[PDB]
Each structure stands twice: as structure tokens, then as C-alpha cells.
Design an enzyme around this catalytic site. Structure first.
Site, short mmCIF file in Angstrom:
data_model
loop_
_atom_site.label_atom_id
_atom_site.label_comp_id
_atom_site.label_asym_id
_atom_site.label_seq_id
_atom_site.Cartn_x
_atom_site.Cartn_y
_atom_site.Cartn_z
N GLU A 11 0.87 -1.07 -0.05
CA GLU A 11 0.04 0.08 0.02
C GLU A 11 0.79 1.08 -0.04
O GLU A 11 0.23 2.23 -0.26
CB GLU A 11 -0.75 0.07 1.22
CG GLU A 11 -1.70 -1.27 1.46
CD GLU A 11 -3.00 -1.06 0.34
OE1 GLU A 11 -3.06 0.23 -0.28
OE2 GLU A 11 -3.82 -1.85 0.26
N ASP A 20 -6.48 6.71 -4.69
CA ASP A 20 -5.93 5.36 -4.85
C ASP A 20 -5.97 4.72 -6.50
O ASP A 20 -6.29 5.60 -7.39
CB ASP A 20 -6.41 4.12 -3.90
CG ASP A 20 -7.98 3.99 -4.29
OD1 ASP A 20 -8.52 4.25 -5.42
OD2 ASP A 20 -8.59 3.22 -3.57
N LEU A 32 -8.97 4.06 2.94
CA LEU A 32 -9.81 4.46 2.19
C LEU A 32 -10.82 5.69 3.00
O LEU A 32 -10.93 5.53 4.29
CB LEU A 32 -10.99 3.65 1.42
CG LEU A 32 -11.93 4.31 0.93
CD1 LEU A 32 -11.54 4.89 -0.49
CD2 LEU A 32 -13.08 3.18 0.50
N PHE A 104 -8.25 -6.47 3.45
CA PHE A 104 -7.88 -5.23 3.69
C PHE A 104 -8.20 -4.22 2.31
O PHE A 104 -8.51 -3.08 2.46
CB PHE A 104 -6.40 -5.01 4.23
CG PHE A 104 -5.94 -3.81 4.36
CD1 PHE A 104 -5.27 -2.83 3.27
CD2 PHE A 104 -5.71 -3.56 5.82
CE1 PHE A 104 -4.90 -1.48 3.75
CE2 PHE A 104 -5.46 -2.10 6.05
CZ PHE A 104 -4.67 -1.15 5.15
N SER A 117 -12.53 -20.05 -5.17
CA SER A 117 -10.85 -20.00 -4.54
C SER A 117 -10.95 -20.28 -3.31
O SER A 117 -10.27 -21.03 -2.72
CB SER A 117 -10.43 -18.70 -4.69
OG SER A 117 -10.64 -18.17 -6.24
N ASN A 132 -7.45 -20.25 -10.08
CA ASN A 132 -8.61 -19.50 -10.00
C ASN A 132 -8.66 -18.12 -9.39
O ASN A 132 -9.40 -17.01 -9.95
CB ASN A 132 -9.58 -20.43 -9.23
CG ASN A 132 -11.04 -19.96 -9.10
OD1 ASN A 132 -11.53 -19.13 -8.12
ND2 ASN A 132 -11.75 -20.33 -9.95
#
Ligand SMILES: [Cl-]
Ligand SMILES: [Cl-]
Length: 162
Positions: A11, A20, A32, A104, A117, A132
Site C-alpha cells: 500500500e 488510490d 480509504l 484489507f 477459490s 482460479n
């Protein structure tokens, strides 16, 4: 390597409001602020989040505080989620980090949507799950980060991050 250092690599850290990869107003270590187009609505949420008049800017400590809350909240959402919890519980420590990373980034709801998955990870079918996971908008939009996370689920080591 731990969850903190992993997320800090993916990040980065920015002390000024920024947009972002999706174009949303963010600050710190991937925190965010709002999906709204308005910089003022962003400045607002920011001050609400920190408890002071920040005028779009925060200190390192303030970023690290938000980061500690967000990781905690991410874990706590996985534990509260009927679809996620069992996956998490089945995983070893490195792999758990990989799930927390997805959460996250994309929220509980979003990850909870990778039904197939999730099933494969639970079953410990590593290679199949990596294949996948790659068939997703997630992978197409942030391929270098997705590859890092995926390698982590495939191998169960921190190699992609070293
Ligand atoms: Cl696809
Ligand atoms: Cl990327």
C-alpha cells in the site's frame, strides 16, 4: 515478515490525501476515506477519523494509528464472517496473512465473493486456487500486487516479498 510489513509494502505510505488505484480519496497506509468525488467530503471524513482539523495532511504516527485500526478491523471482519472464518481457521500462519491482505484491500464482502477459490484454499489445493484467483478483475487491475498475494497462497512462504 508479518502482516504489517506486508501491507506496508503493498500500500505504501502517503501523508497527504491521494487517489488510490480506483481513483478514491485515500491517506496513510491504504486507508480509504470516501468513494465520493469530493475532496471536501474527503477532508471531512479525514478530520472525523483523526479527531483534529487536519486540512488534508497527517503525521506518521496518525497514519500508523489508522493502520493499526484497519488491520484489527480486517481480522475481526474475517472472524465474524461465516464464509471467511472457516477458511482462515484452516490456514497456516503465512497464508492467513494473504487472506488478511485481500480483505484489507477489497473488503469482507468482496473476498467472500471468491466462493470457488475459498473452497480450494480450504481444501489446500494450492496450485488450483492460484489459477482460479487469477481469473478476477482484482488480478487484472492490480496484477503485481495480486501476483504477490497469490504466490503467498501457492507456496506458503514470504518469498514474493523478499
Ligand atoms: Cl477473468
Ligand atoms: Cl499492482
Amino acid at each position: 515478515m508479518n502482516i504489517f510489513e506486508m501491507l506496508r509494502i503493498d500500500e505504501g505510505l502517503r501523508l497527504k490525501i491521494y487517489k488510490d488505484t480506483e481513483g478514491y480519496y485515500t491517506i496513510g497506509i491504504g486507508h480509504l476515506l470516501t468513494k465520493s468525488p469530493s475532496l471536501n467530503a474527503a477532508k471531512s471524513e479525514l478530520d472525523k477519523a483523526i479527531g483534529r482539523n487536519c486540512n488534508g495532511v497527517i503525521t506518521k504516527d496518525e497514519a500508523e494509528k489508522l493502520f493499526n485500526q484497519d488491520v484489527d478491523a480486517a481480522v475481526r471482519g474475517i472472524l465474524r464472517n461465516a464464509k471467511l472464518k472457516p477458511v482462515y481457521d484452516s490456514l497456516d500462519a503465512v497464508r492467513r496473512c494473504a487472506l488478511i491482505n485481500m480483505v484489507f484491500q477489497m473488503g469482507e464482502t468482496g473476498v467472500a465473493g471468491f466462493t470457488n477459490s475459498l473452497r480450494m484454499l480450504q481444501q489446500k489445493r494450492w496450485d488450483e486456487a492460484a489459477v482460479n484467483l487469477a481469473k478476477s478483475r482484482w488480478y487484472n487491475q492490480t496484477p503485481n500486487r495480486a501476483k504477490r498475494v497469490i504466490t503467498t497462497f501457492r507456496t506458503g512462504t514470504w518469498d514474493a516479498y523478499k
